[PDB]
Each structure stands twice: as structure tokens, then as C-alpha cells.
């Protein structure tokens, strides 16, 4: 991000935490109290559910 006039080099980790998180944090899913995810599949119009 910056090179200091002294000589030290400023990195992204020096001003922020870098991690693998999530695009969004709004939806949180639990199954019987355990952490979980899932898929709300919807049926296509005029399709056989079975």
C-alpha cells in the first residue's frame, strides 16, 4: 500500500485482517442447534415435484 520514506514497506496486512469469510453475513442457519447451511430449492413452473 505504501513505501515509507524511511525504507519500511507498508503491506495490506499492516492495516487490515485478511481472511476467507463470506460475501454476506445476514443468513445464519442452524439444524437442531448445530451450525449448518442448506439449499431452499424451488420447483420450476409446470414441473413434476416427484
Amino acid at each position: 500500500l505504501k513505501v515509507n520514506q524511511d525504507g519500511s514497506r507498508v503491506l495490506l496486512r499492516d492495516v487490515a485482517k485478511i481472511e476467507l469469510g463470506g460475501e454476506n453475513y445476514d443468513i445464519i442457519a442452524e439444524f437442531n442447534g448445530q451450525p449448518a447451511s442448506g439449499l431452499g430449492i424451488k420447483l420450476a413452473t409446470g414441473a413434476n415435484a416427484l
Binding site: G21, N24, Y25, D26
Partner: protein, 50 residues
């Protein structure tokens, strides 16, 4: 060109964010949407563009 730039700068919608947005701290109690610069509404506002 200056008029166009001033109009574009001072008449715009800016995404601001959200108070207490996810991911929140362990004790967050309030969640509110932040409102910021919005489009102008009247000829008076446009005339006041600097």
C-alpha cells in the same frame, strides 16, 4: 465541463452502509440503515450547486 462535473458530484446517490451491520460485535443491540447523499429535489437545490 465544470458545470457537468459539479452537477454530477453534488447530485448523486451514495451507498453509505448500516449501523450494527453483520458481522456484528458480540453485544450489538441496535441495527439501523445509514442514509447519505441523495439526489436533489428542487430548482433551488440545483441553483445552490457550488
Amino acid at each position: 465541463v465544470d458545470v457537468i462535473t459539479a452537477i454530477k458530484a453534488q447530485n448523486a446517490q451514495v451507498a453509505a452502509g448500516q449501523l450494527g451491520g453483520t458481522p456484528p460485535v458480540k453485544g450489538q443491540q441496535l441495527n439501523a440503515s445509514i442514509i447519505a447523499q441523495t439526489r436533489l429535489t428542487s430548482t433551488e437545490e440545483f441553483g445552490k450547486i457550488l
